[PDB]
């Protein structure tokens, strides 16, 4: 359909959002999320969207590159576990974000973590969010 | 069994160049407190240490730490010979290098 009036018109309404050629952004609506990849802009690489700015949208959808999915689980996709999220983040920040440091210091990092709770409480969700947001 | 032949023992202080003996043990070999003493080990090894007087130790036993025993290739309770040599003099230059197996990751 007319994706323009469906998504982009509310997205750029009254907001002077800077836009760079080649990037991607996510628009949430219609009980789903849509990724839009910017193709071109008049002012070289970066520009500011204005009410008088023309927005061209005609064309076939682009093919996904090596860039990761923007709908994957993150720290914002988990709720009510702030203390446990902080504990897991402080337990896994050193071995994951700074791995080679543990070849130097010689201190053994934590290895085994057991999450327990009622079924459906979100253990797999927390694990996936931690893995994705640390690049592991 | 000459008086300069003793049995090693584990020490309380973990200094790598300190050996504790009872004063009566040192009296038989003219050893004085704070002197420099040579010790002969096994498999043609030997070390040099300094001496401290401790009354808790006994005459047959001599107290050392793990590093000295590893250098001497001996174990706890073994028999060693202790000699004295005043030729140990102040040195001008000593060249020391670390072991590759332990310095991994630190530069
Ligand atoms: N704390 C939470 N916040 C948001 N969604 C949750 C939470 N806990 C569970 N869910 C939802 O439940 C669904 C499945 O739960 P799951 O993690 O598989 O259960 P379990 O932790 O028993 O394996 C997930 O799709 C997730 O969206």
Closest-CA residue to A44 (of A73, A76, A20): A20
Cβ contacts of B106 on chain A, cutoff 8 Å: 104
Closest-CA residue to A117 (of A75, A84, A72, A77): A84
For residue A54, how far is its CA from the centre of ligand 1 (angstroms)?
A: 42
Question: Which experimental technique did the depositors report for determining this structure?
Answer: cryo-EM
CA separation (Å) from A18 to A10, A65, A76, A82? Answer: 15, 22, 23, 32
CA dist., res. B79 & res. B77, Å (int): 7
Please tell me what DSSP assigns to residue A117.
-
Contact B104 A103 (CB under 8 A): yes
**Tokens 């130790």, located at residue:** B57
Closest-CA residue to A72 (of A127, A119, A113, A109): A127
Using DSSP's 3-state secondary structure scheme, residue A33 falls into strand
B38, B85 Cβ separation under 8 angstroms: yes
Handedness of CA B42, B37, B68, B1 (dihedral sign): positive
Q: Which residues of A touch B (CB under 8 A)?
A: 103-106
Phi, psi at residue A65, to the nearest 5°?
Answer: -90, -165
Q: Which residues contact B22 (CB under 8 A, 6 or more apart)?
A: B53, B54, B55, B57, B58, B59
**Tokens 């839009």, located at residue:** A36
What is the experimental resolution, given in Å to one decimal place?
3.0
Cβ pairs A/B, distance under 8 A: 6
Structure tokens, B66 = 């793990």
Is B101 an interface residue toward A (CB < 8 Å)? no
Please tell me what DSSP assigns to residue A107.
P
Cβ contacts of B105 on chain A, cutoff 8 Å: 103-106
Structure tokens, A58 = 């005609």
How far is CA A78 from its chain centroid? Answer: 13
B48, B36 Cβ separation under 8 angstroms: yes
Handedness of CA A47, A48, A49, A50 (dihedral sign): negative
Contact A105 B105 (CB under 8 A): yes
CA dist., res. A124 & res. B27, Å (int): 74
By alpha-carbon position, which residue is closest to atom 6 of ligand 1? A122
Using DSSP's 3-state secondary structure scheme, residue A72 falls into coil
Secondary structure (H, E, C), chain B: CCCCEEEEEECCCCCCCEEEECHHHHHCCCCCCCCEEEEECCCCCEEEEEEEECCCCCCCEEEECHHHHHHHCCCCCCEEEEEECCCCCCCCCCCCCCCCCCCCCCC
| Ligand 1 pocket, mutate which of A77, A84, A114, A120 (most atoms under 8 A from CB) | A120
Separation in Å, CA of B96 to nearest CA in chain A:
22
């Amino acid at each position: 359909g007319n994706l323009f009036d469906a998504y982009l018109k509310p997205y750029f309404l009254e907001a002077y959002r800077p836009v760079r050629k080649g990037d991607l952004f996510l628009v949430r609506g219609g009980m789903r999320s849509v990724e839009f990849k910017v193709i071109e802009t008049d002012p070289a690489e970066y520009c500011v969207v204005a009410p008088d700015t023309e927005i061209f949208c005609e064309g076939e959808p682009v093919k996904r590159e090596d860039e990761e999915r923007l709908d994957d689980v993150g720290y914002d996709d988990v709720g009510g576990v702030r203390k446990q999220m902080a504990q897991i983040r402080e337990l896994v920040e050193l071995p994951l974000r700074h791995p080679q440091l543990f070849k130097s210091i010689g201190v053994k990092p934590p290895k085994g973590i057991l999450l327990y709770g009622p079924p459906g409480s979100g253990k797999t969700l927390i694990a996936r969010a931690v893995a994705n947001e640390t690049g592991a | 069994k000459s008086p300069n032949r003793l049995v090693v023992d584990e020490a309380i202080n973990d200094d790598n160049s300190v050996v504790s003996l009872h004063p009566a043990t040192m009296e038989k070999l003219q050893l004085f407190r704070g002197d420099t003493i040579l010790i002969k080990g096994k498999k043609r090894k030997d070390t040099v240490c300094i001496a401290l007087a401790d009354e808790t130790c006994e005459e047959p036993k001599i107290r050392m730490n793990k590093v000295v025993r590893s250098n001497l290739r001996v174990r706890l309770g073994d028999v060693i010979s202790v000699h004295q040599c005043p030729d140990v003099k102040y040195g001008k230059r000593v060249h020391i290098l670390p072991v590759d197996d332990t310095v991994e990751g630190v530069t």
